[PDB]
Design a protein around this ligand. Structure first.
Ligand code: GSH
Ligand code: GSH
Lengths: 218, 219
């Protein structure tokens, strides 16, 4: 059976958990503790990090038979290929590639603010309307970002949007179609059942040493 | 009508795309935007057209090809890679190219950080390289290309990142003979070689005008 290793956080692992839940893929989650401040010790992870067979040790990792993967996007694409969640046509694939990279940039910008520079918060929330407009416009009246077909990048998008809503609950207010997107994803029957299940991880979004985690406790 | 690659007059993250287009012989206008002098480093021109190109996520680089309009460097690379037979085929090749694309992307950001804003930490950065390059060395092994027997778009990424890193520290590949062999193999392909002897080929600047590494080295 497959093993998913990560912190006990959402961060950039959640879109993977969401894919696994949507597909009814049984998996084993391996977490690693982070100690209390100020050292935030990670000895357990460090004790095994180079002993797992991974070409480039990191979190999250995915161990599936003799398939051993790091890089969260490499893992989403891997699962995508096994469960019909890749783009199909050339027009679909340029949409999914582009937005995968754009969401990655956004998620990094979110991490920058939420971990070490949470004093830049009101500036970060001020730049979101312009960013979200670009997604709003890109999605248009499509049910999913690639068009008619649900793809792995909808999982990434939903989760990043949802995390930003935790940071700023009004950030989707000006964009009806983006609000309709979150609801569409949440209403997928397999998503709705996963999110009601015992393994669903609601908190925390970031790790314990992120300022966002320390101040808001989400 | 036929394709426009838009970027600064630098190598940075757009050169691996230039290396792909060159290898495939595809004709493209490269459209450039200027950057003003210190202290302003003006970008009025680019900023004047940036939102008027019909790009979904306006940015540099971009690639315009008929009604196809693309931003995100890796997205452009993957698009060229599907077009020209430079994707992996095997399940094992695809999991290898995905991982290394993403790994090189991280590595490249770490390099940009040090060369643009934190060039004071350069000795610490160079000292960090061996452990990272060791990972790339072992990953590659005796294969001629990172995906296996087959040349893919992520060799175009790996060669340029390693070459930029050689411009930073001439000694960085020294303990890794397969990696050094890789730079020359890529350099030895005939589409590559002629592209490099072409006048349009960019050797410098690696980074933009306002990078500390550029101000100091002038490469
Ligand atoms: N580009 C990587 C970033 C992975 C990453 O930064 N993981 C963090 C947690 S979000 C980490 O703890 N990395 C290093 C480590 O665990 O040793 C990916 O997408 O997977
Ligand atoms: N993740 C993006 C990064 C794009 C990017 O950072 N572009 C820089 C130059 S390296 C830029 O000047 N963009 C133009 C802008 O901000 O308007 C990619 O891989 O293309």
């Amino acid at each position: 059976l497959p093993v998913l290793g990560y912190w006990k956080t959402r961060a950039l692992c959640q879109p993977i958990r969401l894919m696994l839940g949507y597909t009814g893929t049984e998996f084993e989650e391996k977490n690693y503790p982070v100690g209390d401040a100020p050292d935030y010790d990670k000895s357990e992870w460090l004790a095994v990090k180079f002993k797992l067979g991974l070409a480039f040790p990191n979190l999250p990792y995915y161990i599936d038979g003799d398939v051993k993967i790091t890089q969260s996007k490499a893992i989403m694409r891997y699962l995508a290929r096994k469960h019909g969640l890749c783009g199909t046509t050339p027009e679909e694939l340029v949409r999914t590639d582009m937005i995968e990279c754009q969401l990655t940039d956004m998620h990094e910008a979110f991490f920058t603010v939420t971990y070490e520079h949470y004093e830049q918060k009101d500036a970060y929330t001020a730049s979101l309307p312009a960013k979200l407009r670009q997604y709003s416009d890109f999605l248009g009246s499509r049910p999913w970002f690639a068009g008619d077909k649900l793809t792995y990048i909808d999982f990434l998008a939903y989760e990043i949007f949802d995390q930003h809503l935790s940071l700023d609950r009004t950030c989707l207010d000006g964009f009806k179609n983006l609000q309709a997107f979150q609801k569409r994803f949440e209403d997928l029957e397999a998503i709705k059942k996963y999110m009601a299940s015992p393994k669903f991880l609601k908190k925390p979004i970031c790790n314990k040493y992120a300022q966002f985690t320390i101040i808001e406790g989400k």
